[PDB]
Amino acid sequence: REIITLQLGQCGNQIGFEFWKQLCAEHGISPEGIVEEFTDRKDVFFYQYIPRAVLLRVIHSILNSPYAKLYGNNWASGFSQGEKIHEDIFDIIDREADGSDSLEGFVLCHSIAGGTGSGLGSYLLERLNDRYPKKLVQTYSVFPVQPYNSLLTLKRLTQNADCLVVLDNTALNRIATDRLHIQSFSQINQLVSTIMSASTTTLRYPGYMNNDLIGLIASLIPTPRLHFLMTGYTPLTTVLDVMRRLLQPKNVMVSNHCYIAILNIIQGEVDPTQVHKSLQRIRERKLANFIPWGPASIQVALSRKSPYLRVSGLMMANHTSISSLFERTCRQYDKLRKREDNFDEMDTSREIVQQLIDEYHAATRPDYIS
Template structure:
């Protein structure tokens, strides 16, 4: 999107949803992140036909839709998965006539990635090796020779089929990008724990960053629940390998932590056993609210660059945590309090409303600081109320900011959607960069180290060329990058962060950009 005013004809980024359902833990149920969550489907019907009452809404329907030749609205979204179950469910649902079938990718083998990052990265069927082992001719080989045959077969499979899939994926992305008047970037929805969302998502991040190097790449990334035992035993491996790509190849990552989402559902919404639908509802609330200023634009924060530029002062610290209030699962939930701007902004700063579990009540976590904050306030709000609320928050010292940057809360005002009835007069979303998020990454590293120390489940990865001949350098490099990321977030808490990384080059992360406090040129406005 190039324009900065309401009359701009610029187009926001296409959405890419990667991964599907699967796995007893339900992590992959989050991978689907059906993009219609983010789109205001209250004004086009479920077949994309604009309702009469929606013609005077004053919103920009072209943000997440385009009009086909027959004038019905089509989501500007791509759905990609290596197994058909979830996408088939969407195509057989009430939204079956909404999506462009040319923007749906399902691997021909339909075998999924088997919760294996490497399988998803190479778009390989997880059941190919199993099928190969059933051939009588294969059993004639000695065990050592069987492993070599596996390697040769998989390499040939990935080169032939992987190339075909790469061309199909890029054709879909290029076609959607070419249909934009002024492409600004891409939005990727995925999980980091399973196989497709993590592996295929990583592949797309690298490809988009290389193919569209000057365009923004924003992700909504679902992190696994780290307080419960997962059926995906290689979850720490998948998370670590994906975190490397999120660090090096994404411009903004909105972290959606399943640990915190479940806690909020239990403690704040009083749901004993939250279902996937209910936690998905929390995710959809964040995604919808974060795009409000794009769909109902004003004079500021009406494009993706303007929205993110002030939130990400340094290129590597681009992981954002969110908070939302008031939270309700049911749209017409009973109202028990009067919402005001001060009440909303104060609650957004409370740990119990933050959707990242890194803000633990520990001594070390209490020293964490905000790098930047943007509050998106929806409703009929007087700007003077915002000024008074900010002054009250400052007087009460409710926020602990870094010392080397501007210590202020930015506020974007947006009117509420006229198509959705809500029980509250004022609601708010907080997008924040916070040094405490490093504790979430440290947990991922800790879980990885426990598995790696036992050399557990590594054979699942050695079957792929990237890890062939027992080459595990990809794991080591990913660990080093995440450790450097944790160190940088910790360094942000010191007043002399601007000088950090200049004296010791080992602290600077590998890849493009620097860690010395420079602003990503793609976020310059």
């Protein structure tokens, strides 16, 4: 099973290039796409070595980078231009798809804040939902006329993408000023690429469980609507300390309430016998709450750090608080709707995002069913 990734817009292209840099460094692959001498399953993201990427001005910057051997601002303009070159890009996508043995998904890295990447990703998501009906679509979308584009992207993402991971530049900048003392794109992108590389750790280093994307998705997302996740990365030592530092709101990349599903990935050489004690004590001290209707638990898995490159850890959560962010956008849209062919698509977008926020707000009730 092979995962193909797509990079749209300046932000998406930059974060994808840095992610590929990080992943090539994790393995023994020189910038010249030649394996270095110096166990790690690398077939998923690399083709025998060339990455499975589809880039769509900064391309010249990448071509001038040492890694050359490795390959308007409106939403409506982006959508129109994406409709204009449907066949041109889809020939590339189809040749790269059918060239693969068994395709699995379509990772999409783009910024929904604005520009052409937003509308282009909208159009691509629609067309991929049209053509390929059996391919999971995960999206590493990055959160920031901007409210218009953002809400349109949310409208297209709440029904097409079978999963989604949010990344807000505000929280990243906050963490940068707090514990990195920057005052830049090229600095927050480091942490972004770190989180991304650590996200797909269990796919490249095989373990007891989590050998496929469905193993990561179907565990967290219980219903097809609640498919927005948040990330946490504590190392910026026992597993209990890691789990206690992870659940702190100081580290989560997010600006009653309870949890739906939690997943922990530990990349250290820790003793794997103390994890059950860690979970026992976490349940004892009652540091986190769960849904009252269905039985929801926390899952933990281990892995191995890249030997060619200490204890680290990442956390993927399904928290109902994320809806708050949408509200802000929603709010701004209303503020933008009363200040200034049919202009009805934006109204439908507002309607469906209101539906989604209502569903999130109803999810935290003991009678969420019906």
